[PDB]
């Protein structure tokens, strides 16, 4: 209910905890002389000061550190050479792992997944789970801030994963990274290429469809090539995810939910950087401006959309601070239920360059019914008003679908609305120029203040009447149509 | 019953409070590079460390700072450029706001009014609500030391508003400034021109016609041209207002 821009800013600057009993474990001799031995972490090292157990109340497994979840431990290898595994640490409650593994390959997946969660105490604790490996290679699924027992028992507070490899973090295909209601994670290697189902936001419990359920994948330190492959934001709830990337984000298939948000935030121009008691300074950031060479190549946007019927739509949204928002050959899908499902492809201080076909219900035409008003929407350079929304592909609209663009200069190559009709083809936010190359209308609600459509086709509406081309606002003084060809 | 000359003189010199948990919030980068962005204050910044709620006992809304009404906070922008709004902070109980906004235009009115009140505890607390904007432009109604719930619940102690702009404090026509039984306010801009219904003294409760109900608009620092337009002192009671102006 607060918003993600408050939440990520207020957990950006916290003291970690106050842990008593700081355990210290050091891997001595024996580990540092076999470069391919294929050790383990839990059974070989970590089960000394991590105890199992049973949570009374609908649990399966249970893990904390020692005598409660309020004790820091650490592992300080710094010369251990080989390859490792975690392989089965599930429902870890714990608190303050930091497995320092220089020149050591890790693997968080072997025959079983992992989990990292905290409990909701009265102290409001985090986990701050760190790793400092060389490679990581998650290679199986991982849940962060999951459901510990099954609904009842003790609740789950926030957490932090932190993965700070020195060579790269790849992933396997069946490695469903799924962070939940309060979870964040940071990455610090070079050339992260997560080839698995990234799942920001999930149902923490069985039926709680009204959770806020924020998340964050703050890949701020990644000096190489970020390459996601398959995101998924939201699951039957109004999740508000966010990613603070490192000015290069090539992703693949994106699967938003109906009422799910996304905030891909590029870095700034020069890059990042009986007694009174004084709380520390909570520095906050508003929506700033991305740098010059900030590229976000989201190459496919799908949408999952099913469920109930509300009095409006739900307006999925992705907000981008990058100076480019290229959308490639996959184009923009829109799943549409009986009500009007809506998406918002918004850009604050950048451009938008869509080179793909705007689909709806996964076909190119995409007829919709009367109550289902599918609403495409584009905002190119809101807070700078010099941002262009260039669509270098021929778009195709069916019936009861509504394009609107509120940009500085909305270039086009071809618009097809004559097949379906009832298309509010709005342009009310356009500053100066609309370069539509070809227009096909049956019953359209065009509102342009200034344009030059160099070729215009006005088709009829079959045999019924009341359906026509309609310019519903002032056409201005610099307007122009180089060719009109009625049929 | 004491008289206003005793009351304004005895709240002229007080220690502010004894607040533990002095929260400090600073607006960093992002705010200071868009001169016309039209932000908000509550949802964009202030709802981080100001919580809503419900007073059990005839309330509508309820706002304090964090874990009780005895915690100072502050906002230290000092370079944030643009224009802002409060727009709907009603029945604020809180305590010790001071929103330091150099080179920032404010607006305390957009689609909803505001309120600033304290509670009658055993500690006899004030609010000392400060603002340090560039322009202010109240532009909708504002109640100071109002009725928090509806008669019952917790009572309302004294308060202080303080508005210290650097260019001027105008007002809109429907902006009924209405400070009550214990409220004061000070102004420090130049050429204050309140074009609205200034209402010193009002019925704090439904039928209490025998309250003393003092007030003060101490425009002491105004170096320009004070220009009120429409005052109203007292409402079905023996209110004793007072203004310490700046010789115009």
UniProtKB/Swiss-Prot annotation, chain A:
Keyword Signal found: yes
A single GO molecular function term of this UniProt record: toxin activity
Keywords: Cell outer membrane, Membrane, Periplasm, Secreted, Signal, Toxin, Transmembrane, Transmembrane beta strand, Virulence
The name this protein goes by in its record: Vacuolating cytotoxin autotransporter
Protein's job: Induces vacuolation of eukaryotic cells. Causes ulceration and gastric lesions.
GO cellular component terms listed in the entry, alphabetical order: cell outer membrane; cell surface; extracellular region; periplasmic space
Domain notes: The signal peptide, cleaved at the inner membrane, guides the autotransporter protein to the periplasmic space. Then, insertion of the C-terminal translocator domain in the outer membrane forms a hydrophilic pore for the translocation of the passenger domain to the bacterial cell surface, with subsequent cleavage.
Complete-protein stretch covered: 60 to 581 of 1287
UniProtKB/Swiss-Prot annotation, chain B:
Domain of life: Bacteria
Function in brief: Induces vacuolation of eukaryotic cells. Causes ulceration and gastric lesions.
Domain notes: The signal peptide, cleaved at the inner membrane, guides the autotransporter protein to the periplasmic space. Then, insertion of the C-terminal translocator domain in the outer membrane forms a hydrophilic pore for the translocation of the passenger domain to the bacterial cell surface, with subsequent cleavage.
Name this protein carries in UniProt: Vacuolating cytotoxin autotransporter
Gene that this polypeptide is encoded by: vacA
């Amino acid at each position: 209910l607060l918003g993600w821009g408050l939440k990520q800013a207020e957990e950006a600057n916290k003291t970690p905890d106050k842990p008593d009993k700081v355990w210290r474990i050091q891997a001595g001799k024996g580990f540092n002389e076999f470069p391919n031995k294929e050790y383990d972490l839990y059974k070989s090292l970590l089960s000394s000061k991590i105890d199992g157990g049973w949570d009374w109340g609908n649990a399966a497994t249970h893990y904390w550190i020692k005598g409660g979840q309020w004790n820091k431990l650490e592992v300080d290898m710094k010369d251990a050479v080989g390859t490792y595994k975690l392989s089965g640490l599930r429902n870890f409650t714990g608190g303050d792992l930091d497995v320092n593994m220089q020149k050591a390959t890790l693997r968080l997946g072997q025959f079983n997944g992992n989990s990292f969660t905290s409990y909701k105490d009265s102290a409001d604790r985090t986990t701050r789970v760190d790793f400092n490996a060389k490679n990581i290679l998650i290679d199986n699924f991982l849940e962060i801030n999951n459901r510990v027992g099954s609904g009842a028992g003790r609740k789950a507070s926030s957490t932090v994963l932190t993965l700070q490899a020195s060579e790269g973090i790849t992933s396997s295909k069946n490695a469903e990274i799924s962070l939940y209601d309060g979870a964040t994670l940071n990455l610090a290697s070079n050339s992260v290429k997560l080839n698995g189902n990234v799942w920001m936001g999930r149902l923490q419990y069985v039926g709680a469809y009204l959770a806020p359920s924020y998340s964050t994948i703050n890949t701020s330190k990644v000096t190489g090539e970020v390459n996601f492959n398959h995101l998924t934001v939201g699951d039957h709830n109004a999740a508000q995810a966010g990613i603070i990337a490192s000015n290069k984000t090539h992703i693949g298939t994106l699967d938003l939910w109906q009422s799910a948000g996304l905030n891909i935030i590029a870095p700034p121009e020069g890059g990042y950087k009986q007694k009174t008691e004084v709380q520390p300074t909570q520095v906050i950031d508003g929506p700033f401006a991305g740098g010059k060479d900030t590229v976000v190549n989201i190459d496919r946007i799908n949408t999952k959309a099913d469920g109930t019927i509300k009095v409006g739509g739900f307006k999925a949204s992705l907000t981008t601070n990058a100076a480019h928002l290229n959308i490639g050959k996959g184009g923009v899908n829109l799943s549409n239920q009986a009500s009007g499902r809506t998406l918002l492809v918004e850009n604050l201080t950048g451009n938008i360059t869509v080179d793909g076909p705007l689909r709806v219900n996964n076909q190119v035409g995409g007829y919709a019914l009367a109550g289902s008003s599918a609403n495409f929407e584009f905002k190119a350079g809101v807070d700078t008003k010099n941002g262009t929304a260039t669509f270098n592909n021929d778009i195709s609209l069916g019936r009861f679908v509504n394009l609107k663009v509120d940009a500085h200069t909305a270039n086009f190559k071809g618009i097809d609305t004559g097949n379906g009709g009832f298309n509010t083809l709005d342009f009310s936010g356009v500053t100066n120029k609309v370069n539509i190359n070809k227009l096909i209308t049956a019953s359209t609600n065009v509102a342009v203040k200034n344009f030059n459509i160099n070729e215009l086709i006005v088709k009829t509406n079959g045999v019924s009447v009341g359906e026509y081309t309609h310019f519903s606002e002032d056409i201005g003084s610099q307007s122009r149509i180089n060719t009109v060809r009625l049929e």
